[PDB]
Amino acid sequence: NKDMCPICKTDRYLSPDVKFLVNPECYHRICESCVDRIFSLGPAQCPYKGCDKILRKNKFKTQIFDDVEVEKEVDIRKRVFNVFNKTIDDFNGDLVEYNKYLEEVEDIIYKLDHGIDVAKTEEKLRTYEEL
Amino acid sequence: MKFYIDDLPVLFPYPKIYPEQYNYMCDIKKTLDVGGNSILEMPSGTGKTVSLLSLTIAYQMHYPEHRKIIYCSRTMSEIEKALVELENLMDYRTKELGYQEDFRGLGLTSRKNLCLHPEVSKERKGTVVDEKCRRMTNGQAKRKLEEDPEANVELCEYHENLYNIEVEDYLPKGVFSFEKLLKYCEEKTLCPYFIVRRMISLCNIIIYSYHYLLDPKIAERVSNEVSKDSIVIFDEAHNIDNVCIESLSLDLTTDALRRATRGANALDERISEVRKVDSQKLQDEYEKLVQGLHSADILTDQEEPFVETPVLPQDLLTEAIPGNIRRAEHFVSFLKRLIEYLKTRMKVLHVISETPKSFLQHLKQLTFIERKPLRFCSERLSLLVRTLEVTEVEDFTALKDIATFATLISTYEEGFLLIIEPYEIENAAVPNPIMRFTCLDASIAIKPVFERFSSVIITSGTISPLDMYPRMLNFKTVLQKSYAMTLAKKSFLPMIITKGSDQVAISSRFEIRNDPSIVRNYGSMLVEFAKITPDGMVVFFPSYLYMESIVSMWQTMGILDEVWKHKLILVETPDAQETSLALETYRKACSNGRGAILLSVARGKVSEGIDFDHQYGRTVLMIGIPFQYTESRILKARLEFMRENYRIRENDFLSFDAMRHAAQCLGRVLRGKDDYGVMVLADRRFSRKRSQLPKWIAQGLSDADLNLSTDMAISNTKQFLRTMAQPTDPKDQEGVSVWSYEDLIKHQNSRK
Amino acid sequence: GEKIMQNDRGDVIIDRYLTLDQEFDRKDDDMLLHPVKKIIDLDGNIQDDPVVRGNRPDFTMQPGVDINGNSDGTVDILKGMNRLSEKMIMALKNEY
Amino acid sequence: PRKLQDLGLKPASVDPATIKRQRKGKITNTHMTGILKDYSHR
Amino acid sequence: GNPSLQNALEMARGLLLPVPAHCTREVLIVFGSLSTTDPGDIHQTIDSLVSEKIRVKVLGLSAQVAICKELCKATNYGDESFYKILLDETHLKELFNEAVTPL
Numbered sequence A: 001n002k003d004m005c006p007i008c009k010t011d012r013y014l015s016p017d018v019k020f021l022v023n024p025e026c027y028h029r030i031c032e033s034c035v036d037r038i039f040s041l042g043p044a045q046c047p048y049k050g051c052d053k054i055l056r057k058n059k060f061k062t063q064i065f066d067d068v069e070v071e072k073e074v075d076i077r078k079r080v081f082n083v084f085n086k087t088i089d090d091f092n093g094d095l096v097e098y099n100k101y102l103e104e105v106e107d108i109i110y111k112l113d114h115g116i117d118v119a120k121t122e123e124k125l126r127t128y129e130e131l
Numbered sequence B: 001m002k003f004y005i006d007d008l009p010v011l012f013p014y015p016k017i018y019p020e021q022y023n024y025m026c027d028i029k030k031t032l033d034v035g036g037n038s039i040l041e042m043p044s045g046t047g048k049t050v051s052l053l054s055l056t057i058a059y060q061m062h063y064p065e066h067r068k069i070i071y072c073s074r075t076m077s078e079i080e081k082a083l084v085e086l087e088n089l090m091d092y093r094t095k096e097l098g099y100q101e102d103f104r105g106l107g108l109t110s111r112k113n114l115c116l117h118p119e120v121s122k123e124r125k126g127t128v129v130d131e132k133c134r135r136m137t138n139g140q141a142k143r144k145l146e147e148d149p150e151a152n153v154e155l156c157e158y159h160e161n162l163y164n165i166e167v168e169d170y171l172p173k174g175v176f177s178f179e180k181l182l183k184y185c186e187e188k189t190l191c192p193y194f195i196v197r198r199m200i201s202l203c204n205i206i207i208y209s210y211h212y213l214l215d216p217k218i219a220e221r222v223s224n225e226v227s228k229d230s231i232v233i234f235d236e237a238h239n240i241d242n243v244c245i246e247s248l249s250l251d252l253t254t255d256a257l258r259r260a261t262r263g264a265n266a267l268d269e270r271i272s273e274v275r276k277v278d279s280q281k282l283q284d285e286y287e288k289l290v291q292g293l294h295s296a297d298i299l300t301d302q303e304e305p306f307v308e309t310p311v312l313p314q315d316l317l318t319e320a321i322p323g324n325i326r327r328a329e330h331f332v333s334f335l336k337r338l339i340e341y342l343k344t345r346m347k348v349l350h351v352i353s354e355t356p357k358s359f360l361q362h363l364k365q366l367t368f369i370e371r372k373p374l375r376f377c378s379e380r381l382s383l384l385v386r387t388l389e390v391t392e393v394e395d396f397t398a399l400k401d402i403a404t405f406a407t408l409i410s411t412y413e414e415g416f417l418l419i420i421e422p423y424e425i426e427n428a429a430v431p432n433p434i435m436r437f438t439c440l441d442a443s444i445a446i447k448p449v450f451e452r453f454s455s456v457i458i459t460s461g462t463i464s465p466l467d468m469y470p471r472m473l474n475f476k477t478v479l480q481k482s483y484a485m486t487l488a489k490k491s492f493l494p495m496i497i498t499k500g501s502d503q504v505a506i507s508s509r510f511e512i513r514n515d516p517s518i519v520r521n522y523g524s525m526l527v528e529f530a531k532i533t534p535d536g537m538v539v540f541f542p543s544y545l546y547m548e549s550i551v552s553m554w555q556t557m558g559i560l561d562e563v564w565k566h567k568l569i570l571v572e573t574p575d576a577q578e579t580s581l582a583l584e585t586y587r588k589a590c591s592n593g594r595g596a597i598l599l600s601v602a603r604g605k606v607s608e609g610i611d612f613d614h615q616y617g618r619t620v621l622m623i624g625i626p627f628q629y630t631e632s633r634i635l636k637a638r639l640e641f642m643r644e645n646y647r648i649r650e651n652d653f654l655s656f657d658a659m660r661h662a663a664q665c666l667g668r669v670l671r672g673k674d675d676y677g678v679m680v681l682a683d684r685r686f687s688r689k690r691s692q693l694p695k696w697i698a699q700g701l702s703d704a705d706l707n708l709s710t711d712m713a714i715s716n717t718k719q720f721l722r723t724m725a726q727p728t729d730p731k732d733q734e735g736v737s738v739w740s741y742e743d744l745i746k747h748q749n750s751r752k
Numbered sequence C: 001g002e003k004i005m006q007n008d009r010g011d012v013i014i015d016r017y018l019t020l021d022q023e024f025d026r027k028d029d030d031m032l033l034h035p036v037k038k039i040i041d042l043d044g045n046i047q048d049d050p051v052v053r054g055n056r057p058d059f060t061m062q063p064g065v066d067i068n069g070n071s072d073g074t075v076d077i078l079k080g081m082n083r084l085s086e087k088m089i090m091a092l093k094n095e096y
Numbered sequence D: 001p002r003k004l005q006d007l008g009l010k011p012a013s014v015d016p017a018t019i020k021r022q023r024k025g026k027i028t029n030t031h032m033t034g035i036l037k038d039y040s041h042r
Numbered sequence E: 001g002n003p004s005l006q007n008a009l010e011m012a013r014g015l016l017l018p019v020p021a022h023c024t025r026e027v028l029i030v031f032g033s034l035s036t037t038d039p040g041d042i043h044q045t046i047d048s049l050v051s052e053k054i055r056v057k058v059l060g061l062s063a064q065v066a067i068c069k070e071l072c073k074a075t076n077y078g079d080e081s082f083y084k085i086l087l088d089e090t091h092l093k094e095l096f097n098e099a100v101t102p103l
C-alpha cells in the first residue's frame, strides 16, 4: 500500500512517524522505524516476502517520485550519467555523433532498467568507467 | 454614394456619411499610403466597420498592388457582423458598377461552428468535434477503406465531395457569411470548414478571430497561407493582450497529472503491443528522425499533428531530434519521469514564483532532463501518436497538455513565469494544487505579426488611452487618434453615481460586497432605473461571483419582486447555450415591449461581441468599476513585469484595464446617431477616472454629473428620455452630424 | 427563487414533487433549447478556438462553491429565473 | 480533547467544562388603579 | 393594474371590423406606461392590424417605447411621425388638438 508500511503494519493515520524510505537495490515501501529496527545491528535480507536480497542500512533514502519504476529509472540514469558525461563540446560539434551517443546512453539505461542484458551492460559500464 | 479621397474612388453603401466616417477613411488611407501601424478610436454608434470595409475594398480594387485584407476581430459574432456588412457593401458595389467583379471574402471559424455532419453535430466540445473530424478525415481512414472495402471505418461525405471539384469551384464569387455558407454547403453537401481552409489563399479578404493570428496552436497554418504583404485590420483591439497572454499561457492540475500518468501508461502499453505485432512502423520513424525529417516532412498536408505547435514558428528549433526521445520507449520514459517531476513539484505547501530557467535547472539536477529534448516534446508525441495510429486519444489529451507545457517552458525563459499554488481556490477545504505557466509579456505573441505585416490598423470603439498600447505592446505607431463624434443633440448621457438616494456611499470592492447599505442602494437604483427605462436595460457587474452574491441577496431582500413587476430578469449563465437563449429572450422582450433587464458580467461573454442597439440598450448600468482580483498571483506577476519593463504602474495599469472594460461595456449601447441610451456608472471611484474614459464618452460626460446621487440621476435620466423621445430636427442635423454627397463635396473644397 | 436550505421543514406531501419539478425543468429545457443566429451565438464565440488552454480564471469568474467545493445553489436561482422568463416569452409564441 | 492535537491526531471533541468555563412606590393616581397597564417593554 | 397593448389592439380590431371600407379605421392610444404585459404575440396583432388597414397613433407619456414606435410605423406605412411623446402640459394639449384633424 502507498499509505502504510507493510513490514511494521502501521497506518499513516495513527502513526505519522512513518516515512517513505526505499533502497536502490530493491525499492520497498518501508519505514524509518523498521529500518532502524532491522538494519542498525547489521546488513540483512529484504523483509518483504518473496524477496531475499542483501542490503545495507546506509544505502536507504527517501523516494522522490511516486512511481517505483520512475524512481528506479532515474536512479539508474544517475548511475549511468555519473561516468557517462560526454557533451557536444566533447564531441567537437558533431551533432549526429552526439545524437548517436545519446542513443547509446538511453539504450544502456533501458537495458539496465529492464534487466534484459544486465551482465553484458554491467561489464561494458565497468570497462568504460575504468578509463 | 461614390466619392473620391485623393485619387481613390470610394463606394459607400449608404446615401449619407458621417464626418467621423470620412475623417476615419482619410486617416486609414494616409496610413496605407505611408505604410505603418495606426491606432484609431472611432466613437461607437458610427459606422466604424462599414467605413473600414468600404475604404479597404476600394483601396484593394483600385490600387494596382491589390493587397489582400486580413480582418481580425475578437468574437465570432463580430466576424459574422463584419461578413454581413461586407455582403451589403459588395451588393451595393455590384449595383453601382453594373457587374459583380472578381471578389472573394470569407470568414473563418472552427469545426464546431462549421460542421454539417449529422453524427458529429451534438458534441458539446470543440476538441472532440475536431478529433472526430480528423478520425474521419486524416486520409488514413480513406486509405484503409480503399485497401479493405469492408472496413468498419467511415468517411465524411461533405469532406469527400470536395475532392470531385476544384478549389476555385468550391463557392461562387462573392461574400459568404457563416449562415449563408452553411446553407450553401448543406444544399450542395460540402464541408464549409475545409472549403474555407482550402481557399484562404484565394480570398481578397479573410475575416477571423484574434486566436487564428496570435495563438500559434492554430495560427501556424493560417499565417503561412495568407499573404505576408497584406493590409491587416485589428478590429476591437482593446482586449488584444488577453488573447496574446492566453495564447502562451497554460494551467496544470493534479487531475491533469493523474490522467497524464494514465495516458503515459496506456501509451507504453501501445508501443508494447505494436512492437509485439510489427516493428517496421516504428523503425521507419527512427530512420526518418535519424535522417532529420521533422513533423512537417513526415506529416502529410491533409492530416494534422496530434499536439498543436504551442510556440512561435521562429522560436521552434530547426535541428534534428537530440536522440534522448527518438525511440518510442525512450520518449515514453522521458515523458513519464517529466510527469513524475511535475507531481513532485506540485506537492509544495506554499506559493512558488519561479523562472523557467530555474525550473529547467531544478529539473535537470533532479531528473536529468535537458532543455533541448523538451523543446521537441510536442513534435515527438505527435509523431509517435501518428505512427501508433491510435483510435482513442481521450487518455492522450493530458499527454497533449504535458507536451504543450514542456515545449512552452523549454523554449521560453524571458517574459514568462511559473506559479505553483497550493490552493487553487481558498474556499475549498481539501487543498488543490495548481501549476500555471503564465506569459507576462503580451508583446511576445504579437511581435511576429508586426514583423510580418507592413500595415496594421489597430482599431477599437473604446481604445483608451491610446499611448498605452505602443508601450504595452512593442510596436511603433505612425498615427494614433481618437475621434470626437459630432452630434446635433447629445445622443448619450454618461452619469457617474457616487452615492445612493440617502447619500450613503456606494462601491463594489470585493470585501464589502455583503454590506447591506450598498446592496440596498444598488437594488433601489436598479428598481428606479427599471421603472423609468422603457424597453431594455443591461447591468454589468465586476465579477460573476459578485453578481451571484448580490442577486441572491436581492432575491432574499425582495428587490427582484418589484423588478419583476416591470421587466423580465435574465442573468448571464456560465453555460453558453443558456446565455445565448437568455440573450435571445432578452432581445425578444425588448422587441415586443414587455421590458427586460439583462444582468451580465463586465468581463464575461456578453460584454464582448454582443451589441445592445436601440431597444436592446437604452441603459448600461455599471455596478462599480470592473476591477480584476488584485491579489491573484498571475495578475501581480504581470503588473510587476509591466513595472520593470514598460514603467507602467500598479494602480495605473489596474485602472486602465478596469476602465477599458467599463468603456467596452458602455460602447455597446450605440449603433447610429439616431440611437440613444444612458450610461450610468455606480461607484465612488469613477469620479476620478473621467480622463481615463474614451474621448467621446468624456465629451458626453459633463462636469456636473461626476458626483451624482441616485434620485437626481433618475431625474436626469427621465429628462433625457423625454427629450430624445421627441423627433429631432432635420434642419438641425442636415449638415453638421451627417453629410450628404454635396455636403461632403463642400467639406472637401473647404479643406483644399 | 429563494435559496433552498435544509433546516426548513417544507411539507412532506408537496416535497416529493421536487424531483418531478426538476424533471419538468429538464423537459422545459428540451424544447427551449434551439440553435440561435450567429449574431448571438456565444457558444460558437467560445468554441471558435477549441484548443485554447490559457490560464484558468480566478474564483470570482466561476460560480460560488461551498467548503467542500460543491455548488452553493446561487447559479440554480439564476437558471430558474432565466427559465421563467423564457417560459413567459415562449407562452406568447402560440396560435393566439 | 486538548492532548490529541499534542499527539498529532485531530480531536473530534471540544474541551469539556472542567478546563476553562465561567420597588413599588405610592400611587397618586388612585382613580385608575387597574385602568393603567404595566409596560416593561417597548 | 398592468397595461395590455395586445388586448387593447385586439378589441380595437374587433370594433373596427364592422366599419365600412370608405370609413377610415384609426386607433389613438394614450399610453402611460413604459412596458406592456401581453397574453400572446403582439407582432401577430400588428400584422393583423396592417392587413385590416387600421392606422394607430400613440401619444406616449413618459418615453419612447419601441413596440409602440414599430406599431405606429407598420400601421402608418413607414411613417415614424405618428408616435408622439409629450414634453409639457401645453405640448400634450397640442398633441390632443393635432389628433382631431383627418389623417
Ligand code: SF4
Residues within 6 Å of the ligand: B111, B114, B115, B116, B117, B120, B132, B133, B134, B136, B137, B156, B157, B158, B159, B190, B191, B192, B193, B194
Ligand atoms: S469534414 Fe467538415 S462536415 Fe465532415 S466532420 Fe469534419 S468539419 Fe464536420
Ligand SMILES: [Zn+2]
Residues within 6 Å of the ligand: A005, A006, A007, A008, A009, A010, A018, A030, A031, A032, A033, A034, A035
Ligand atoms: Zn515499518
Ligand SMILES: [Zn+2]
Residues within 6 Å of the ligand: A026, A027, A028, A046, A047, A048, A051, A052, A053
Ligand atoms: Zn527486496
Ligand SMILES: [Zn+2]
Residues within 6 Å of the ligand: none
Ligand atoms: Zn480558575
